[PDB]
Design a protein around this ligand. Structure first.
Ligand SMILES: Nc1nc2c(ncn2[C@@H]2O[C@H](COP(=O)(O)OP(=O)(O)O)[C@@H](O)[C@H]2O)c(=O)[nH]1
Ligand SMILES: Nc1nc2c(ncn2[C@@H]2O[C@H](COP(=O)(O)OP(=O)(O)O)[C@@H](O)[C@H]2O)c(=O)[nH]1
Ligand SMILES: Nc1nc2c(ncn2[C@@H]2O[C@H](COP(=O)(O)OP(=O)(O)O)[C@@H](O)[C@H]2O)c(=O)[nH]1
Ligand SMILES: Nc1nc2c(ncn2[C@@H]2O[C@H](COP(=O)(O)OP(=O)(O)O)[C@@H](O)[C@H]2O)c(=O)[nH]1
Ligand SMILES: Nc1nc2c(ncn2[C@@H]2O[C@H](COP(=O)(O)OP(=O)(O)O)[C@@H](O)[C@H]2O)c(=O)[nH]1
Ligand SMILES: Nc1nc2c(ncn2[C@@H]2O[C@H](COP(=O)(O)OP(=O)(O)O)[C@@H](O)[C@H]2O)c(=O)[nH]1
Ligand SMILES: Nc1nc2c(ncn2[C@@H]2O[C@H](CO)[C@@H](O)[C@H]2O)c(=O)[nH]1
Ligand SMILES: Nc1nc2c(ncn2[C@@H]2O[C@H](CO)[C@@H](O)[C@H]2O)c(=O)[nH]1
Ligand SMILES: Nc1nc2c(ncn2[C@@H]2O[C@H](CO)[C@@H](O)[C@H]2O)c(=O)[nH]1
Ligand SMILES: Nc1nc2c(ncn2[C@@H]2O[C@H](CO)[C@@H](O)[C@H]2O)c(=O)[nH]1
Ligand SMILES: Nc1nc2c(ncn2[C@@H]2O[C@H](CO)[C@@H](O)[C@H]2O)c(=O)[nH]1
Ligand SMILES: Nc1nc2c(ncn2[C@@H]2O[C@H](CO)[C@@H](O)[C@H]2O)c(=O)[nH]1
Ligand SMILES: [K+]
Ligand SMILES: [K+]
Ligand SMILES: [K+]
Ligand SMILES: [K+]
Ligand SMILES: [K+]
Ligand SMILES: [K+]
Lengths: 205, 205, 205, 205, 205, 205
């Protein structure tokens, strides 16, 4: 009973990390999980090793690439990120659906290796709103913000490669759209044929 | 642009009828409609012509087959039923999603002509429960009930042909399942790219 | 197996009427129905025979009492009302939960004959609010209003006899309360053991 | 104003710990709490003393039994567990409803000492699903899993002693069933007579 | 005490009509009603006198203007429409919130006479979508559609006059938005102080 | 794009801290935040500096007052509390709506400096319930409780200065009332004119 891989991408300031965390709190670990990526970037305050990321040195990441540790890996704004194959295969084979919060470059690598995976792209409801979300608390220089928005513009040009699109205007609407996609996918005949492997056998008698 | 054609089929005793009506009350005529089939069966008490069905004589339906007026037609439960082509094509072109409540024979003909149609099959939660619903008020003979149940079993044989499976155990749940499918499909990239065209242009500088 | 008999009573001005209709629209005829009482009162405008009530003459209702046709009967607000036994027993045996919208006199007679019946009493949120609802469009005389309010107070005296109390302040809340009771009862072990019989056998090797 | 004790039992792999935690996050501490049991078992990673359990040595547990510290205690798969009487009585007398996540042996002891307590049993939706939930991440030997399933089979044979049954097929449905039971129980006339001690006094005037 | 007067205006193609009906089905006649306007336009098929509109002749409506029977009146889409004063004042005095589905001309006259009236404007999600809804079944000429769209644009010019803006993209969302406004207003201090008068007295010793 | 300040006050035992925390978990930080106050009171177990409060010595608080650090400050039951101006102005100017959990004295100071802020007062559903909530786990002396209730009585006399009133009888109802207020306020024409700054421009063409 193999589970389904879900790809979730978005520019910074579309609210993707908060949409996925809120989805996860409604779901037991036997239905849905998130993958823990590897990264070279510094742990932020509040972040714990093995929960959000496995944090590693540049040289250790390199080692991992060279021994084919990764289902996908990429550089994103000055650091490396990747999804280790072993833990993914292991969780999917227990029937769990697994969320991959990754950029468009990782999404592409996943699509070719796992053609069944479903990908969701999240957009902000406008440029004005994107800019206000991107600015955060509002203490970065104009320059640092132009570079941010430019990285976001790059991410967004890749949206058409995804199977679903969520416009995250209003958080609760968008959360509901995300739950709706996963729920609809579980109503697919292949999935249902199984988990319901005969009630159906009992129906056709 | 084009709305999506939905096919919904079910044995009797699966609550499919009330599920579709309930869904329509929450949905504007510009989003979602049901197709008005032609048939030779008699109107039920309190059932208006042109709203549930176009009711015609045996002789009239046979001449409609000759004029090639139907996208599908079939014989179901001792009467003839057909889906007039002109109205489907006309409602779909205005962007409305159109539901076809038709049997498995009909669904096959539509699949061949309209291959992006999506199909929903609806099952009862058990055989005993199927029997309890078919029996209804329990005033019918054992002989009539026997014929309804064999027809139901025969209908259920063809489930594996459909894209989606809903197990209608609890009505509200099954209603949320039908609403869920419709909503997820509207979140697909092909339709969202259309609906949010202006937004996407702005966002990509 | 057997459906559950529900009794619902309330003074007028407690919104009990619309609560029951609203509940029924969300619920199939094979899950939940309302009992059709006989009465001597006139039909209201736009009120059909056999659907809300079986409307009979004073002389006809008196002969129904003699034939022992009622599970309960009583005099309410200057007219006679009764619950025909045959249809209750017949709907209940098909597994349908049946609601009896009857007064306190009726509820006592049913309690004695049918001791697993469950009863719901419905109260207004205050006396002032009760008065505001009773007054309605405010076109009635102070004398008629005076008689409606004494009847309401008399009805409310008998609340402590019922299994459940709903305070109907906010309609949607009170609707969720009525849906909630019905749903919890269906979760009781006696009914769930029946509904999931096949599952339980499998589970226990 | 004494609160209600709720008993929640299930085999491992019916998702009970996750159903109760999610219920609790919707409820303030003046309405609903969980009891903190005593156990001899080792704290898992993430577990904190006094939150999930009071962790104690074998000898300390023994001391507690001998001085009648426990409303119930039992051995469950190679460790001891129990509910201390003092903290329970103290919380219930402040009107809080208290959840006891305990096995069937503890449930029995509670039933005799507190006959008002309501018990809920949770089942998995099938054996296949139970087995997949039981297997977790999927790294235990076949042997260790047969023993797990055998402990689960034992738990499940005791389900008929409970007042309610939840089949935990779909987490959100099952969570809603749990909230529905507590909510229905609060609509009971005894409870309502109190918390609403006169609005009612004001109604009967 | 007094209910609140609501004004709702919208171009056609904003789904305002079905939004108001849908809202009313969830709401008792003692909480919320729609005003019955007089008009000279013909009844639509299946549209009853005194329930949607009081339908009168041109000559009758002109004499109603002379008797000062209207709180507002105006000419809309080639016919005359008016809000009879007596019924508004009479329903409002019984504590009912009354909705006026009227155009911008009407809303101005009501604002001047009734300055605590609250007003809701409803917009379509885009021009293309507005066009798609106006076109409807697509059987009208390009000339008629042209006149409907100029009327819609003219109506939308006056939006900035209203207290509240609802963008009706997704029906259920827009329905929740209309329910939300009504509910928040009932939470204002002036109305809550009235509704919970007895409670507040007790609470303040 | 300036955000809206929300004031939330209540006596102890109306459940205000739990209502606000639950609201916040549904909202991303770019829509809604809570302010972190300064206080001289001791950190409770579980409390962390900079999350719930900035904890400071009596002398440091004094320093802050003397250099005009505070938008509002006050003494509440033997300790000082205040909201620093800088962090507030900074967050509001990024378009975030900010919740201020403060007493009636702070509310007043905020009202004069920021006349756009919206204030919500929460009441317990009765004195009996207030007293039971105030008593907590139930281990304080009668005397300590009379003083508690007396501080609560003082808070409650100031309720009429607030724009909204929530009666927190049932947690989920009250949470929904709180979400409804914020949501309604976002439907106001001033707010909507902006975030929707032309779709509208595109509508009037
Ligand atoms: N290819 C790939 N991208 C990743 C992976 N993990 C995170 N990212 C991307 O890294 C980007 C920034 O991540 P992060 O430092 O956590 O900031 P944030 O997620 O926007 O708050 C996001 O677009 C992620 O999609 C990964 O394992 N593989
Ligand atoms: N193929 C075909 N079947 C139809 C059509 N309309 C209705 N049916 C089927 O014939 C059966 C109709 O039963 P009906 O008289 O409406 O009673 P119902 O089952 O409660 O709807 C159902 O299975 C429908 O799916 C049609 O247009 N074409
Ligand atoms: N005991 C008895 N009372 C009934 C029966 N049917 C209706 N009633 C009661 O008589 C009253 C009927 O009022 P009705 O004419 O229907 O106006 P309503 O109050 O809005 O329903 C209500 O209190 C009902 O409970 C019945 O079958 N038996
Ligand atoms: N009798 C009794 N059983 C308990 C008590 N606390 C926990 N248990 C049972 O111990 C079993 C396993 O508990 P645990 O080690 O926490 O694993 P888990 O709850 O399945 O994740 C469950 O069936 C509980 O019902 C208790 O205080 N008394
Ligand atoms: N001012 C004024 N306008 C009204 C009144 N009643 C309806 N209208 C407006 O006239 C138009 C009526 O259109 P109608 O014939 O009902 O078709 P509809 O647009 O689907 O409701 C709408 O814009 C209404 O707002 C009224 O009493 N006074
Ligand atoms: N004026 C003002 N009051 C505050 C501030 N922060 C907290 N309070 C008030 O202090 C009172 C007690 O706070 P606390 O010690 O946290 O107890 P609790 O909030 O009831 O659990 C509450 O009424 C708050 O409204 C503040 O920054 N300014
Ligand atoms: N406008 C705004 N966005 C914020 C603030 N704090 C965090 N964010 C955004 O919230 C998201 C983090 O979940 C990012 O898009 C941040 O930039 C704030 O104070 N204002
Ligand atoms: N069990 C049962 N099913 C019914 C009753 N009335 C209608 N039905 C069923 O409800 C469905 C129509 O809503 C059909 O499947 C009918 O057979 C009844 O009294 N009992
Ligand atoms: N306050 C008020 N109650 C009404 C009105 N019309 C009907 N009702 C009440 O609404 C209920 C019927 O739905 C009854 O309790 C009626 O008295 C009205 O205009 N105002
Ligand atoms: N199938 C599956 N169940 C898991 C996994 N991780 C945890 N669980 C289950 O989730 C529950 C813990 O809440 C237990 O029933 C675990 O066995 C996993 O990766 N796969
Ligand atoms: N696109 C579309 N709109 C429709 C159709 N039928 C009715 N409407 C629209 O739906 C609304 C009435 O519910 C109006 O705005 C109508 O123009 C249809 O078939 N297609
Ligand atoms: N009745 C009651 N209230 C409690 C208990 N524990 C905490 N609270 C209340 O819950 C609130 C804290 O969120 C305060 O009003 C506390 O007094 C308890 O055991 N019983
Ligand atoms: K990641
Ligand atoms: K059909
Ligand atoms: K009745
Ligand atoms: K426990
Ligand atoms: K009107
Ligand atoms: K604070």
């Amino acid at each position: 009973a193999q589970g389904t891989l879900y790809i979730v991408s978005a520019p910074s300031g579309a609210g993707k990390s908060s949409l996925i965390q809120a989805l996860l709190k409604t779901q037991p670990l036997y239905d849905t999980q998130v993958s823990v990526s590897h990264t070279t970037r510094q742990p932020r305050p509040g972040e714990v090793h093995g929960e959000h990321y496995f944090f590693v040195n540049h040289d250790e990441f390199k080692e991992m690439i060279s021994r084919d540790a990764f289902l996908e890996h990429a550089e994103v704004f000055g650091n490396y990120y990747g999804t280790s194959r072993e833990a993914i295969e292991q969780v999917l084979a227990t029937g769990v659906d697994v969320f991959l919060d990754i950029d468009w470059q990782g999404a592409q690598q996943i699509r070719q290796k796992m053609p069944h995976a479903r990908s969701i792209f999240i957009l902000p409801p406008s440029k004005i709103e994107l800019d206000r979300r991107l600015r955060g608390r509002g203490q970065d220089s104009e320059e640092v913000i132009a570079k941010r928005m430019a990285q976001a513009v790059a991410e967004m040009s890749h949206y058409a490669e995804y199977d679903y699109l969520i416009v995250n205007d209003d958080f609760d609407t968008a959360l509901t759209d995300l739950k709706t996609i996963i729920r609809a996918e579980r109503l697919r005949m292949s999935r249902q044929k199984q988990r319901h492997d005969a009630l159906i056998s009992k129906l056709l008698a």
